[PDB]
Amino acid sequence: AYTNSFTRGVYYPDKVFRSSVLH
């Protein structure tokens, strides 16, 4: 009973808008 999460799971970490800027 195992399967891999390919790239899921990431989220907006801190609620401070950033446009078109790699954080």
Add this chain to the structure above:
Amino acid sequence: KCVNFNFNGLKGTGVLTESNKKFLPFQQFGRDIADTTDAVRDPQTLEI
């Protein structure tokens, strides 16, 4: 017009203008590149 603003302790000086960037409802600040505070919401009337 250049004006001191004190948003619940967020103190600064600048020209506040009608914002045109779309903050998602969980966002209460705005940062440009190099962490410059580019936009802010009012903690009282919720204006960007």
